[PDB]
């Protein structure tokens, strides 16, 4: 699936990865959390918040 960064984001921990308002993310895993997504960016893979992005099937 596709993901779209809506706001700027700077990780908080090792299991999270950054982006900047506009990144096109690769939606890999998703443990049905209702607050986060596991996606690929910039040569890394990590958690990103749902309210900071928008999904696009």
């Amino acid at each position: 699936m596709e993901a779209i960064a809506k706001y700027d984001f700077k990780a908080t921990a090792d299991d999270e990865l950054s982006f900047k308002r506009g990144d096109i993310l690769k939606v890999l895993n998703e443990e049905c959390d209702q607050n986060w997504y596991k996606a690929e960016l910039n040569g890394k893979d990590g958690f990103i918040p749902k309210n900071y992005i928008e999904m696009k099937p």
Partner: peptide, 10 residues
Amino acid sequence: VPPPVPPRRR
């Protein structure tokens, strides 16, 4: 001003 981030780990 972006949203309040969610508490991780549910």
